Amino acid sequence: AITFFKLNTGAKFPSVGLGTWQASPGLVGDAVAAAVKIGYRHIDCAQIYGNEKEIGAVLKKLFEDRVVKREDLFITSKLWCTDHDPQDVPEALNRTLKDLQLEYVDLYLIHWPARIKKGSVGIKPENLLPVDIPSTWKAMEALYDSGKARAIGVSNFSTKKLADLLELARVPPAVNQVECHPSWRQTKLQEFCKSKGVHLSAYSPLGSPGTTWLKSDVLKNPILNMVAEKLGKSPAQVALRWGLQMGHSVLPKSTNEGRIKENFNVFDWSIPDYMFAKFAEIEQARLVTGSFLVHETLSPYKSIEELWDGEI
Numbered sequence: 001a002i003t004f005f006k007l008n009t010g011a012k013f014p015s016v017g018l019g020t021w022q023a024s025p026g027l028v029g030d031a032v033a034a035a036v037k038i039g040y041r042h043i044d045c046a047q048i049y050g051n052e053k054e055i056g057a058v059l060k061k062l063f064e065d066r067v068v069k070r071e072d073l074f075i076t077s078k079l080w081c082t083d084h085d086p087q088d089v090p091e092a093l094n095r096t097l098k099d100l101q102l103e104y105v106d107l108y109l110i111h112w113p114a115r116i117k118k119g120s121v122g123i124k125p126e127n128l129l130p131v132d133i134p135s136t137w138k139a140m141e142a143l144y145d146s147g148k149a150r151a152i153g154v155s156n157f158s159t160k161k162l163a164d165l166l167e168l169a170r171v172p173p174a175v176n177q178v179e180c181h182p183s184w185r186q187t188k189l190q191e192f193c194k195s196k197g198v199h200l201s202a203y204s205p206l207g208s209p210g211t212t213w214l215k216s217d218v219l220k221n222p223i224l225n226m227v228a229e230k231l232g233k234s235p236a237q238v239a240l241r242w243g244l245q246m247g248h249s250v251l252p253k254s255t256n257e258g259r260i261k262e263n264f265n266v267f268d269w270s271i272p273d274y275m276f277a278k279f280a281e282i283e284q285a286r287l288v289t290g291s292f293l294v295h296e297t298l299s300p301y302k303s304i305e306e307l308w309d310g311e312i
């Protein structure tokens with residue numbers, strides 16, 4: 001069925017989470033409510049998504065109304081690039097906790113391996129700062145030690161950056177949340193993660209078709225669509241079930257009730273082995289390049305290639 005994965009802390013991580021990037025403050029509450037009512041037990045959040053207060057207000061209502069108990073939900077949030085200095089780390093989590101109306105998060109992630117100055121809404125390369133992941137991770141470890149974050153992890157870390165952190169960390173990252181879908185399979189990183197006991201969690205598992213500045217080609221892939229037609233499932237369902245069968249969690253985002261439901265119905269069927277093999281020939285390209293962190297003169301990362309340590 002593949003309904004959860006065990007983290008290196010022992011915690012059960014539900015395998016399908018509701019994504020909330022680009023879910024507006026006006027729509028995200030009803031989306032979270034609908035998702036939890038349908039059976040989702042995992043919500044992927046971030047301070048930078050601009051909607052944690054609205055998520056918190058609905059979580060409060062769901063708990064009060066006895067739809068779910070806090071202990072049965074898995075809530076992830078992420079430390080934004082402005083808040084990597086160790087002094088700023090616990091303040092950043094405390095703001096997220098206040099907004100989400102929680103006493104702890106189940107998972108707290110370093111969102112990207114980069115620092116940015118406070119004080120611009122927009123990102124400009126002038127505001128990029130030198131990076132110090134070991135120092136930031138030590139501050140994350142204190143949040144884990146105190147129970148404010150029951151698990152800590154990273155996001156957008158290449159194999160090399162994750163390896164470098166693992167070599168020196170006291171608390172190993174529980175999760176590395178990265179772009180992963182049939183057009184960006186991440187087999188190298190997944191294998192490394194598995195060997196080290198780190199769970200890989202897939203963002204943009206549908207290829208983020210609603211993002212205007214990305215090509216919308218993942219759910220249109222002919223191999224994927226043939227499998228969908230043969231099994232009587234939607235292209236999104238096939239993409240999601242594929243991810244589960246590859247051994248990673250998936251974080252599909254929707255603000256539409258029907259799609260939220262559709263995306264969760266990925267446990268009562270499977271992609272048969274021979275059909276599954278066909279996915280291996282889908283052309284590969286990374287959609288989310290992290291170009292906002294890349295600059296020839298002003299950044300620790302002079303190119304996209306450097307940001308991903310060649311994983312492009």
Ligand SMILES: NC(=O)c1ccc[n+]([C@@H]2O[C@H](COP(=O)([O-])OP(=O)(O)OC[C@H]3O[C@@H](n4cnc5c(N)ncnc54)[C@H](OP(=O)(O)O)[C@@H]3O)[C@@H](O)[C@H]2O)c1
Nearest residue numbers: 019020021203204205206207208210236252253254255259
């Ligand atoms: N750590 C990171 O740096 C990072 C980066 C990117 C994403 N993420 C996380 O991962 C989540 C998922 O990634 P994502 O939001 O980029 O994209 P995604 O989940 O791959 O795709 C979401 C898009 O697909 C549409 N959609 C959802 N279900 C569908 C279905 N059944 N059929 C057809 N279209 C469907 C949505 O529209 P509707 O909303 O209208 O249904 C939306 O436009 C994010 O929301 C966020 O939580 C993290």
